Coordinates of C-alpha atoms and ligand atoms in Angstrom, one line a residue:
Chain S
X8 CA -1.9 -2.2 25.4
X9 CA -3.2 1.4 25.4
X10 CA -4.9 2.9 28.5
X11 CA -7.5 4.8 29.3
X12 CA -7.7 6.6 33.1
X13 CA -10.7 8.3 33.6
X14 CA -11.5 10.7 36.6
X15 CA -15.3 10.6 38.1
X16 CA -17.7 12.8 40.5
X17 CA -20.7 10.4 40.6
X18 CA -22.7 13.4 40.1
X19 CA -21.2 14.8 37.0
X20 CA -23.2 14.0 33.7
X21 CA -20.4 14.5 31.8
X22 CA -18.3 12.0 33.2
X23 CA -21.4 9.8 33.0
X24 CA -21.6 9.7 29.8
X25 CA -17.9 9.8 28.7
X26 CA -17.3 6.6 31.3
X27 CA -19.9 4.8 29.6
X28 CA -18.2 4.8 26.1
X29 CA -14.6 4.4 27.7
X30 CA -16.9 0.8 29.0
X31 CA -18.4 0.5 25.0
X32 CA -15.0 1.0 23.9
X33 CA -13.1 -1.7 26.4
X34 CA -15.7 -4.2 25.0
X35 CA -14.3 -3.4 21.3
X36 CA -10.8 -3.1 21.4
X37 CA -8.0 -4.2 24.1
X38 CA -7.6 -1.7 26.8
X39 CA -6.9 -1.1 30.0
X40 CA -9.3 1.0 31.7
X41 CA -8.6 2.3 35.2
X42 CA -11.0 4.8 37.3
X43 CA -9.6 7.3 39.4
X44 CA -11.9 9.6 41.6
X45 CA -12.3 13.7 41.4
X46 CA -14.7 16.0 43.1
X47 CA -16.9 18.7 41.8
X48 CA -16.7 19.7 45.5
X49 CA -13.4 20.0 45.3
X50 CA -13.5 22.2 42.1
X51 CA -16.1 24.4 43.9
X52 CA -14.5 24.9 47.3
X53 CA -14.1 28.8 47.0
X54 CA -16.6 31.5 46.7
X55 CA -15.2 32.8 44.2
X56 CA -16.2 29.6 41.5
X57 CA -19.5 28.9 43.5
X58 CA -21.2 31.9 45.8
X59 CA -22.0 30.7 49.4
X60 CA -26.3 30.8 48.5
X61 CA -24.8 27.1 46.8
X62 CA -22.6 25.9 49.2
X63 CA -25.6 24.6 51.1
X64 CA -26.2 22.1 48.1
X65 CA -22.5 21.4 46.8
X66 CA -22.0 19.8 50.3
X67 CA -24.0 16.9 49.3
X68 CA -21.5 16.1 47.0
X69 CA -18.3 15.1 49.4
X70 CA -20.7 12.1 50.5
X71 CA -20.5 10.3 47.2
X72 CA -16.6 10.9 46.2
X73 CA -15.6 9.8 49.9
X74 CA -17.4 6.7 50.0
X75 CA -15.9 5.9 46.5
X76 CA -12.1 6.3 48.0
X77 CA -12.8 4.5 50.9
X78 CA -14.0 1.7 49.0
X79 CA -11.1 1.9 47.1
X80 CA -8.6 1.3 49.8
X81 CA -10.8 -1.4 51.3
X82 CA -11.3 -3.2 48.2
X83 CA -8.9 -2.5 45.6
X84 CA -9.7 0.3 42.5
X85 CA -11.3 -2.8 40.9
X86 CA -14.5 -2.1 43.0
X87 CA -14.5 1.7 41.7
X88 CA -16.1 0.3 38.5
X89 CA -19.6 -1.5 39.9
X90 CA -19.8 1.4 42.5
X91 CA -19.8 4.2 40.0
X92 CA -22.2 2.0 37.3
X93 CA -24.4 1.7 40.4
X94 CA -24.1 5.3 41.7
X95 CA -24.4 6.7 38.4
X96 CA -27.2 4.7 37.5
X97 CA -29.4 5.9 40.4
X98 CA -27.9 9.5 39.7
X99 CA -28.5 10.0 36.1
X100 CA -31.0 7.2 34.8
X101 CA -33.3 7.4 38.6
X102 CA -33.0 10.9 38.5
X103 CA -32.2 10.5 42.6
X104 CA -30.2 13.6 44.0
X105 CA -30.9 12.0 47.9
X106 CA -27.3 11.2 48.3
X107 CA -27.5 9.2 51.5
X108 CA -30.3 6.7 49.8
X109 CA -27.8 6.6 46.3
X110 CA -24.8 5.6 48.8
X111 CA -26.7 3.0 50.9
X112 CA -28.3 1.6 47.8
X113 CA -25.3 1.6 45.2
X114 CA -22.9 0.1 48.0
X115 CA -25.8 -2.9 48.2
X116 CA -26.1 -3.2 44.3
X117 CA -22.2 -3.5 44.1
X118 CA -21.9 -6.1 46.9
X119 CA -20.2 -3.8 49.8
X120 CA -20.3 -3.5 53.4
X121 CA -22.6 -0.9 54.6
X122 CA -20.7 0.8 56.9
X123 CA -18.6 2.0 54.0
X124 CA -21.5 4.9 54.1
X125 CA -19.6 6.1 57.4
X126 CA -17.2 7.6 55.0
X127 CA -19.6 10.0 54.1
X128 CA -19.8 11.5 57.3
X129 CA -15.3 11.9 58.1
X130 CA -13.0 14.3 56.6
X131 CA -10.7 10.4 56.9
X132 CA -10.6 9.9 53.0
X133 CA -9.9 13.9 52.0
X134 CA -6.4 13.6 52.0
X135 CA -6.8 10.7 49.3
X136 CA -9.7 12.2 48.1
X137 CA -7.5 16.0 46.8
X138 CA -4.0 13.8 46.4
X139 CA -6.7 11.2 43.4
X140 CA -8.4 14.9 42.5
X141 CA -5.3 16.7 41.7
X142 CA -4.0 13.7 39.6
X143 CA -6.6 14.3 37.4
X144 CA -7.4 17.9 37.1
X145 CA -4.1 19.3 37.3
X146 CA -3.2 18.2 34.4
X147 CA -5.4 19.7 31.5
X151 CA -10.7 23.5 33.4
X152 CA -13.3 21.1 34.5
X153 CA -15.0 17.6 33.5
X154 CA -14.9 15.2 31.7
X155 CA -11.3 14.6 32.3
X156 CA -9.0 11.3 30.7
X157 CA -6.2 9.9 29.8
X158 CA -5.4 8.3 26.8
X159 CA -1.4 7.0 27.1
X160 CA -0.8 9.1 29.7
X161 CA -1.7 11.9 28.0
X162 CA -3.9 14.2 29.4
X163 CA -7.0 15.9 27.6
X164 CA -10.4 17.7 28.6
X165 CA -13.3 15.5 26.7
X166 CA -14.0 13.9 25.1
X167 CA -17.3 15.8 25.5
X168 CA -20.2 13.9 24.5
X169 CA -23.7 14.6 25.4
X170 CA -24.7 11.3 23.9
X171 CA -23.5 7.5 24.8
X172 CA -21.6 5.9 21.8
X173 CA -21.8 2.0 21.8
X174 CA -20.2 -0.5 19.8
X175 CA -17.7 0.0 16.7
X176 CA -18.8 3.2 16.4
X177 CA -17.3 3.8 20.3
X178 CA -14.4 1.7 19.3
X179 CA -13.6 4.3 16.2
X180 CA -13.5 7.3 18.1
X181 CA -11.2 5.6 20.6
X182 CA -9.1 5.1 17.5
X183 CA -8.9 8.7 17.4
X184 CA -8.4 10.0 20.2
X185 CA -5.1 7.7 20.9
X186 CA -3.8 9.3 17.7
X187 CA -4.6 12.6 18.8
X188 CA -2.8 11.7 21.8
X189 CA -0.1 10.6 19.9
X190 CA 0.8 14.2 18.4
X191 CA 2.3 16.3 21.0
X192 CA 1.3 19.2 18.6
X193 CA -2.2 19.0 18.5
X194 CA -4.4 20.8 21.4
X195 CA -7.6 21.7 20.5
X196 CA -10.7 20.2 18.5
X197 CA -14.6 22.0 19.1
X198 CA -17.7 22.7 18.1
X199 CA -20.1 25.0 19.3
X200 CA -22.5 22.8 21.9
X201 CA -26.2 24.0 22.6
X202 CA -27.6 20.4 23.5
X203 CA -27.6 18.8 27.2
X204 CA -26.7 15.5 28.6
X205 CA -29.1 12.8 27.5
X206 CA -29.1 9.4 29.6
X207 CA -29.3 5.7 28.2
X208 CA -32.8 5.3 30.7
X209 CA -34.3 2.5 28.8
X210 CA -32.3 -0.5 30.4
X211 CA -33.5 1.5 33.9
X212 CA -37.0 1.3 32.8
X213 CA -36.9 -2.2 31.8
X214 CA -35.5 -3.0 35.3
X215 CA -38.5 -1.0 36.8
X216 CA -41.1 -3.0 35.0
X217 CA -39.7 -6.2 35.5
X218 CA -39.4 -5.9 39.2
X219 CA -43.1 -5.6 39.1
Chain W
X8 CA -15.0 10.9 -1.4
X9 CA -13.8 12.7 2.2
X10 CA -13.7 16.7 1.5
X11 CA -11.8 19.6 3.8
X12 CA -13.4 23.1 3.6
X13 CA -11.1 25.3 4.7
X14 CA -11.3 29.3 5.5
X15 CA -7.4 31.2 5.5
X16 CA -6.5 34.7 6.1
X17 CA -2.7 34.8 4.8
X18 CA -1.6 36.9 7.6
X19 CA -2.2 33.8 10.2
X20 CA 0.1 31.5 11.2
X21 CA -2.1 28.9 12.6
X22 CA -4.6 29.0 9.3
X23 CA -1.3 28.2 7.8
X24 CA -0.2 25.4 9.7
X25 CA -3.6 24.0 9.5
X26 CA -3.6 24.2 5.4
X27 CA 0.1 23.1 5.2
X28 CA -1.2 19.6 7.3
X29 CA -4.4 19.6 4.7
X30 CA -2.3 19.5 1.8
X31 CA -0.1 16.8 3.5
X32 CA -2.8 14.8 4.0
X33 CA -3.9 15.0 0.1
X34 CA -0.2 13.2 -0.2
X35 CA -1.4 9.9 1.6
X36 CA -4.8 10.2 1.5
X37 CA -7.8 10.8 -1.4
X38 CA -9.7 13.3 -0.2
X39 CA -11.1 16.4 -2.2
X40 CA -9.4 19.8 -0.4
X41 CA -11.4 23.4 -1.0
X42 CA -10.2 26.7 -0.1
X43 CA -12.0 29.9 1.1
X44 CA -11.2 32.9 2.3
X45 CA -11.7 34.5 5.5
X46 CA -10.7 37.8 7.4
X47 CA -8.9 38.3 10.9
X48 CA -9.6 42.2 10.3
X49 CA -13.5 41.0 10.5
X50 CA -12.7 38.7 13.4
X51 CA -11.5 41.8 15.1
X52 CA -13.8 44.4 14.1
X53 CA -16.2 42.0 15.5
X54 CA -15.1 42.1 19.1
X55 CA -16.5 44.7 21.5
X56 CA -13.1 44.4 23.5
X57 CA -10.7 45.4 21.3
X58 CA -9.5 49.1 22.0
X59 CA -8.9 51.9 19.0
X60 CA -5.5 51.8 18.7
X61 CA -5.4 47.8 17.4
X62 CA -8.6 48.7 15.5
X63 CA -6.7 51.1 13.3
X64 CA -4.0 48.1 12.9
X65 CA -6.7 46.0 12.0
X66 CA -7.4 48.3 9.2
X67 CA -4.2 47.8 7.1
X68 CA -4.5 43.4 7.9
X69 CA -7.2 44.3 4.8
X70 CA -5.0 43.8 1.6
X71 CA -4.2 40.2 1.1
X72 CA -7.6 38.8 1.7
X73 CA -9.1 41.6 -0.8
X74 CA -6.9 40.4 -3.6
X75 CA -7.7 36.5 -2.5
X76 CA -11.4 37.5 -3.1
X77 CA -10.5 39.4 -6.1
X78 CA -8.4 36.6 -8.0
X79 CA -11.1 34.2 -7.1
X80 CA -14.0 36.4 -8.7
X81 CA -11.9 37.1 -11.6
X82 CA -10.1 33.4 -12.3
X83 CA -12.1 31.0 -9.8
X84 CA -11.5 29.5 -6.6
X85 CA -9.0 27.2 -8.6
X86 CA -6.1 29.9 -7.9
X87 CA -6.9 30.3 -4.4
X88 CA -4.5 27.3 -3.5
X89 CA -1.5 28.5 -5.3
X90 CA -1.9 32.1 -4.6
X91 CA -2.5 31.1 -0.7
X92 CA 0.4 29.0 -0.8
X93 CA 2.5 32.1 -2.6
X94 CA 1.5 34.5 -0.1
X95 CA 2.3 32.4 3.1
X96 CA 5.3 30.8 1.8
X97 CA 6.6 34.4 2.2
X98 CA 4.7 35.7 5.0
X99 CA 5.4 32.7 7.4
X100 CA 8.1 30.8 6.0
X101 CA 10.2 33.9 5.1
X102 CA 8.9 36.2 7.6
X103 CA 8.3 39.0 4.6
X104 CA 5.5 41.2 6.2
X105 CA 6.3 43.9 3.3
X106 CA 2.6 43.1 2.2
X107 CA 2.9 45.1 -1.1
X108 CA 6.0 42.9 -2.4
X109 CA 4.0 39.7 -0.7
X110 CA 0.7 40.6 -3.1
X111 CA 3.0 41.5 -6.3
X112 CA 5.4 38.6 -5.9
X113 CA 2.5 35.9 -5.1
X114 CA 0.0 37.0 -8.0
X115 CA 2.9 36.9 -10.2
X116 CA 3.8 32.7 -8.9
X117 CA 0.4 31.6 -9.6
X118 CA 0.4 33.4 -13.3
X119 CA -2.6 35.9 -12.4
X120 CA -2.8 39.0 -13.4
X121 CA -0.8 42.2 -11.8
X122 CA -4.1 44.5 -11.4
X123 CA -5.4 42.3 -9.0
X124 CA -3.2 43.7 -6.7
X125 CA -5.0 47.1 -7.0
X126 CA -8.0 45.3 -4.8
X127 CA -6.4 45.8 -1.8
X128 CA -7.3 49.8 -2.3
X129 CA -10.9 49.3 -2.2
X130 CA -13.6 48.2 -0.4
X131 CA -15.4 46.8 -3.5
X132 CA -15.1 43.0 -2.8
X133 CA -15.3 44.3 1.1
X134 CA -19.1 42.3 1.1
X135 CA -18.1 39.6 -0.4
X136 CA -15.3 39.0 1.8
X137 CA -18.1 39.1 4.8
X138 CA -20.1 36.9 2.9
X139 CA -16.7 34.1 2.3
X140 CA -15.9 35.1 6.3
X141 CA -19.3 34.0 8.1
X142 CA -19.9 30.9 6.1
X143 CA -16.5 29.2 7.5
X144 CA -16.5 30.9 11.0
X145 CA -19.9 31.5 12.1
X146 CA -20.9 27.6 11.4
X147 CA -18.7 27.0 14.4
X151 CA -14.2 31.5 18.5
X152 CA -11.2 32.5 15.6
X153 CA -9.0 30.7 13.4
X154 CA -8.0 27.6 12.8
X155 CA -11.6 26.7 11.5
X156 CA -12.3 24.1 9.2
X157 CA -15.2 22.1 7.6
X158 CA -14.8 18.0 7.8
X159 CA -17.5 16.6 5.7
X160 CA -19.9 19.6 6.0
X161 CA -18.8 19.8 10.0
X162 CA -17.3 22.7 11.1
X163 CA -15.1 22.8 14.0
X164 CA -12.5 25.0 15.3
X165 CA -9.3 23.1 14.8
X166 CA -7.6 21.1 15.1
X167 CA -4.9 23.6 16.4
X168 CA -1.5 22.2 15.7
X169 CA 1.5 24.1 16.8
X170 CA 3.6 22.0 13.8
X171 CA 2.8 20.9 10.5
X172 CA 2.3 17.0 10.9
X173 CA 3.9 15.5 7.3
X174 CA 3.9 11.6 5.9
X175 CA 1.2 9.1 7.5
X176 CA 1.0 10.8 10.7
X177 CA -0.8 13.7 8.5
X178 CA -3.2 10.8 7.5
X179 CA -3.6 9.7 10.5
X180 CA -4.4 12.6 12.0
X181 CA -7.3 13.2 8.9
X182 CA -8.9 10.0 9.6
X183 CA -9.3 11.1 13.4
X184 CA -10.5 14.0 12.5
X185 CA -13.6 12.5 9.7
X186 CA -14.5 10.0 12.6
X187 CA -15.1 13.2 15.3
X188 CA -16.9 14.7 12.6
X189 CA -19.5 11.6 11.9
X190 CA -19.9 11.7 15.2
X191 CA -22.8 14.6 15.9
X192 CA -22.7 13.9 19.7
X193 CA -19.0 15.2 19.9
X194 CA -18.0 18.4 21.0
X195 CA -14.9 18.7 22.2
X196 CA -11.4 17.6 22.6
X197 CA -8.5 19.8 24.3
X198 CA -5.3 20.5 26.2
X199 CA -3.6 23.6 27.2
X200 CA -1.7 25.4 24.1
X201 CA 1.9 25.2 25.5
X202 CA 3.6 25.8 22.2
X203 CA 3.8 28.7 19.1
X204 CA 3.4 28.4 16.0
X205 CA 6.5 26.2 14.3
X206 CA 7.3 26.9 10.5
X207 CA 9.0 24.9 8.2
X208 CA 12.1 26.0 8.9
X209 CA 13.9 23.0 6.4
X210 CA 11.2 23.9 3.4
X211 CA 11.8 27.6 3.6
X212 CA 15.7 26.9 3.6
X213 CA 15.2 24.5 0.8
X214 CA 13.1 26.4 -1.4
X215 CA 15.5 29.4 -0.9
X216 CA 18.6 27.0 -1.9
X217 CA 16.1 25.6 -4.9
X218 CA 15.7 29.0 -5.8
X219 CA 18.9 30.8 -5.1
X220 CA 22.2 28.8 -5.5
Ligands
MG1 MG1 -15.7 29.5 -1.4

């Protein structure tokens, strides 16, 4: 069937959201979805893309993206999917940027040893980390990154979650976009920022109380 | 019913490709296709990067799109598919950049009137070329731009006219982005130019020729 690999930082909203409709989509039509992990570290390494007054807070973000690959090769790219949910969940819905509680707690909500938080602290999981990176991003810029057949697009970007058919459609048609090897470029001027599904997150809050 | 706005300078060869796909798509789908004109001389005159020497370039890219408005004031926006499809058939199929012979040779296929060449030596329908330019390109960055069910977008860029159900397909992709007001973007790296049709140029010469 068709397939849909998508690249992740945990603490990209974009990704956020455009992983949450390939998941809508996968529950409306027959694909195979595989996750692959990218770093906005990784795409901010140099001072020249992100001044040195920043580097002090894009550090933060190896923990994440390191503790992903390692459970990877632990576990199997099958676990990649509960981790990011539960990282992203605390990320974008919790509004949590203490990395070291998202890790501890994400690996708990996703059923993994603890001690895959060590990764956080190791350069052990770069090598896997750039070779899973440059997969990705090579390819096609920045995030969102997927792609559909094996081919490679930026996007989609959508600052909204679709769900359901409506998911499903423009699945539809973005394999036959990917199906034309002459067609490159579809946009529209954007002036609106990410905005989260949070209500299933509050729900959770109140009914824990 | 599904409708395309779609904005054209003559002089580009991705507005062409872009139109050429439209009307393709009117072949296996029903879907109600409008034409407008548009100006890469205002593109450019727009720019605060663009140094004199290209400026004064600029200046002469004026002609066909003056007629376009022209014919369209004068015989309604009816003649602006046929006299579009004239003046690129010649442009970018035949690689005829002898603008004069382009405007003469095109008024005369769609059956208009000769003196509407005589716009491209004025600046009289200059403001309402502006007017035709910013409604198509400022809703959305330069050409291809079109309007999917009121939606403008830049794009889709296609390096080759897609023909048959492919075309369709290609339409239908593009109405379900548009419904979508959460979408913004979909891209890869350009890694090809612009591809005429090489066979339909060829044919039409042999049609018209031998
Ligand atoms: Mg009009």
């Amino acid at each position: 069937k068709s397939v849909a690999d998508f690249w992740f930082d945990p603490l990209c909203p974009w990704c956020w959201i455009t992983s949450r409709w390939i998941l809508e989509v996968a529950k409306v039509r027959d694909i195979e979805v595989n996750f692959h992990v990218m770093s906005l570290a990784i795409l901010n390494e140099n001072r020249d893309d992100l001044p040195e007054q920043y580097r002090e807070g894009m550090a933060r973000a190896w923990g994440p993206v390191r503790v992903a690959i390692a459970a990877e090769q632990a576990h199997g790219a099958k676990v990649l999917d509960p981790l990011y949910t539960a990282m992203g969940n605390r990320i974008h819905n919790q509004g949590n940027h203490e990395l070291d509680e998202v890790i501890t707690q994400s690996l708990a909500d996703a059923g993994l040893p603890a001690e895959l938080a060590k990764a956080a602290t190791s350069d052990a999981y770069d090598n896997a980390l750039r070779k899973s990176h440059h997969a990705g991003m090579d390819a096609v810029v920045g995030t969102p990154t997927i792609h559909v057949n094996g081919v490679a697009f930026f996007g989609p970007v959508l600052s909204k979650i679709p769900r359901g058919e409506e998911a499903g459609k423009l699945w539809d048609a973005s394999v036959t976009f990917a199906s034309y090897p002459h067609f490159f470029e579809l946009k529209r001027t954007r002036t609106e920022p990410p905005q989260f599904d949070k209500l299933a997150a509050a729900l959770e809050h109140h009914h824990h109380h």
